[PDB]
Amino acid sequence: DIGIDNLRNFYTKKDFVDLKDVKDNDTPIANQLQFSNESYDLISESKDFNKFSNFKGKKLDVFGISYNGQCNTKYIYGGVTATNEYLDKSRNIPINIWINGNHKTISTNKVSTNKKFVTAQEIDVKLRKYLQEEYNIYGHNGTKKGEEYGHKSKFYSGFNIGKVTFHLNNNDTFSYDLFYTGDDGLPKSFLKIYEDNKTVESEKFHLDVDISYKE
Ligand SMILES: [Zn+2]
Secondary structure (H helix, E strand, C coil): CHHHHHHHHHHHCCCCEEEEEEECCCCCCCCEEEEECCCCEEEEECCCHHHHHHHCCCEEEEEECEEECCCCEEEEECCEEECCCEEEEEEECCEEEEECCEEEEECCCCCEEEECEEEHHHHHHHHHHHHHHHHCCCCCCCCCCCHHHCCCCCCCCCCCEEEEEEEECCCCEEEEECCCCCCCCCHHHHHHHHCCCCEEEHHHEEEEEEEECCC
């Protein structure tokens, strides 16, 4: 299943997109923003055409996972925020985690943001990299961390079921499946979850994470 190696690589090894104060190119394309550098163009795709219209030609930040495009292009789903408000300090997002039923609470510099409104993508990708580093959820993390959970899953890990829930202060929520591989195991499919360019107010949410196994 190609999705095993692609989740591991795209979430936990491949460098995230992280652009600050970059100008969108203001093309006529309604569903795409575009950011150029000397070697390639990054195209962000979204279904939030109203947001994209407001962002055309503006100074923006971009964060998330890109995947290769033809010739001189790379793609990301969403990932875009307005460069107008930032917190004074990065906020480490509190994480309530249940690991095979056992609960703990943690915060870490590894899951943090200074954006007043952060994409869900930025937080999720940071979180999954942290979960891989500490719990080896996708297997083959290259350290001894998470050996205690074993290697029974198809990832060579202790886990094959999991969820991240964004828990907003008003007890609205939304969730992503930590082991979703899309229709074909390819990033162009599984990253499409981020195409809404959903954001959250960084000071006013926390994360609930559940990871477990069923044979
Ligand atoms: Zn909660």
